[PDB]
Write a protein that binds this ligand. Structure first.
Ligand code: 3QF
Ligand code: 3QF
Ligand code: 3QF
Ligand code: 3QF
Ligand code: MG
Ligand code: MG
Ligand code: MG
Ligand code: MG
Ligand code: MG
Ligand code: MG
Ligand code: MG
Ligand code: MG
Lengths: 175, 181, 174, 176
């Protein structure tokens, strides 16, 4: 039975497909960061709110010790900063989607100014307009078309985040 | 294994946690079955960072009614300073039906402060769902509608629970080797 | 420059005034239409000496007429009693800190036996034992940990009451 | 936005006028007691006369840069209603009043407290009326005001208007 009956037009990524890719990502990320030298765990900086489901599944798929951080930014200003000093830490930005790349471009500049040991980016979704941006993304879950999607953290007006899958919305929803 | 030697024993396995959460989700779903149809708004989950993050993402997926995510963080009783909001809610909860989602209730001091703070914002309803509950919570004064597990007083880590920010990423909940703590 | 026995600042002057403004406006909304009905002003009962700074700033933040009364109790007996009868009056007990809840419990019992129309409590600070004991308090400025604090009416052996801020006393003296 | 709509006819002293003057008094009192208090190692005792001087003393004490302590007294209209909980022998004591008018309250209280033999006694009043500019030396005077009856900032009419942040005169209809 549909959680939001009639609201989802079509499925883009099943729950099974999402988890399988996250398993792959975690192993790849674990490979690249395999704390024995530095003595400090990989730092996952989650961009609230869309990336919260992604990061909890991803962290459990990463076979090395990881720590959680949470940020929230607007459409350039910080609503919610780090409770952490990332100086000398290995940092991984965890996003749900990169579209224009504006959020990432801003977040990359902010975090790198705090002088971390390293900074990399992991996003679940990447849309075609990200081509025009210039911040390297080491880890990408899926490349998708330009359409507006919801589910698995992705919202429309704070709704549909709780979906286990990702899909597009019926036009009637925006009304 | 993630932390070789650090974990002494496993209190709750990954499957046991997920199985219980599925039970909780269904129970909560039944209690709020008509919420979206009656009020026109979804059940609001207020997650207390950072310990409850893993819990709430699994819980929300286990709840068969529409749920909305909000997150907040409060300071510690420990000189930790006055009890205060470190990270505030994004949306207004006025007239909303709210479920406080916690990882563990122990002394009940955090929940008491949270309950008073959120109540003053006048939600339609306010209830509590915690994954773990310790024996000292019996002296606490805030009603808890949903509890995953009652556990002993021993210090545990995993599935959101930390020791100095470590061990949150474990899929299970376990006790720590005294060499650490 | 801070006095030597001040370890750290728990609450700055600005933080205190900011919260008092919130409490003042809240108290005003709670008693505005009520006071207009009875024709009598809201009565503030100050517990000397700790709550004296708190009550003068609070009263000036409360947008409805308020009257002052002062009481002083021991650590059992009444050192200073009320100057007027509070029968049928709306009374707000004003304290600096509620800890064990012992003082508030005794005062409430003593004041309710004078039959005021309403008897409510406003404290600037509250320590965890008051939370455990589930002490009913209508207005609370701040929840604080068990650490001994001075300033803004709060004292250590009658000292430091005149500080504009609330600071954590250096554990090297208490 | 008036606390007492129509009751206040005029404003004699604004809130910022009172606070500006208190800041000056606190700085003056501080300079006069700085080296003086360090010799004894004991704080200056502020003896407050209830209830009118309560607003004043809380702002004044915060304006005084040297350490101070609070005491409170209540007298009739002369006997003691609330007495000192404390012996002030050898202490430096500053009487804090809201207004000195006839001077009879201050005169009686000054001799009563000197009979407890403090190391030094001084008087500080926020307001002084013309017949008080004349028994007791007042080292610190906030304002010299006319004889007119005023309320606010601790000053009451029938226990009302104490909570006003300013000092002003009442409309004659209030006396009905
Ligand atoms: N739900 C959804 N959101 C979409 C989509 N495309 C872009 N976005 C906007 C995602 N974000 C919105 C940023 N926004 C505030 C910044 O953190 C997200 C807050 P949220 O995760 O709580 O929804 C823009 C990425 P970019 O354009 O800067 O690269 C989409 O298909 N679905
Ligand atoms: N990791 C861990 N933490 C434990 C445990 N028992 C109590 N706690 C303290 C959990 N909490 C700590 C509160 N603390 C700040 C409040 O949000 C948690 C922040 P965190 O979730 O980021 O770790 C106390 C609950 P209470 O005593 O007020 O009812 C335990 O066995 N393991
Ligand atoms: N200065 C200071 N005092 C503290 C503190 N914690 C408890 N107390 C003692 C508070 N006591 C004060 C009682 N005692 C006589 C009653 O008015 C204080 C007189 P005072 O205000 O003139 O200093 C009551 C708290 P409770 O346990 O009865 O609820 C603290 O951190 N600082
Ligand atoms: N509210 C008000 N009161 C005024 C005024 N002028 C003299 N007073 C009388 C002030 N006091 C009244 C004394 N009275 C009892 C003694 O403490 C004041 C009690 P209170 O502060 O609670 O109102 C007389 C000073 P004096 O004539 O002996 O030098 C005035 O303009 N407004
Ligand atoms: Mg995002
Ligand atoms: Mg969004
Ligand atoms: Mg918690
Ligand atoms: Mg913790
Ligand atoms: Mg007190
Ligand atoms: Mg005391
Ligand atoms: Mg007087
Ligand atoms: Mg009078």
């Amino acid at each position: 039975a549909e959680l939001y009956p009639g609201d989802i037009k079509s499925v883009l990524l099943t729950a099974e497909q999402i988890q399988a890719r996250i398993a792959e990502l975690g192993e790849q990320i674990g490979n690249d960061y395999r704390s024995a030298t530095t003595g400090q765990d990989l730092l996952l900086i989650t961009v609230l709110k869309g990336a919260v489901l992604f990061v909890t599944d991803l962290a459990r798929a990463i076979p090395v010790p990881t720590q959680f951080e949470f940020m929230a930014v607007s459409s350039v200003r910080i609503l919610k900063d780090l409770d952490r000093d990332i100086h000398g830490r290995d940092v991984l930005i965890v996003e749900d989607v990169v579209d224009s790349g504006l959020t990432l471009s801003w977040l990359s500049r902010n975090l790198t100014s705090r002088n971390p040991r390293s900074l990399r980016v992991c996003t679940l979704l990447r849309k075609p307009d990200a081509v025009h941006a210039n911040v390297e993304i080491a880890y990408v879950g899926f490349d998708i078309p330009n359409d507006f999607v919801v589910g698995y953290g992705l919202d429309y007006d704070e709704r549909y985040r709780d979906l286990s899958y990702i899909g597009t919305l019926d036009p009637r929803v925006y009304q």
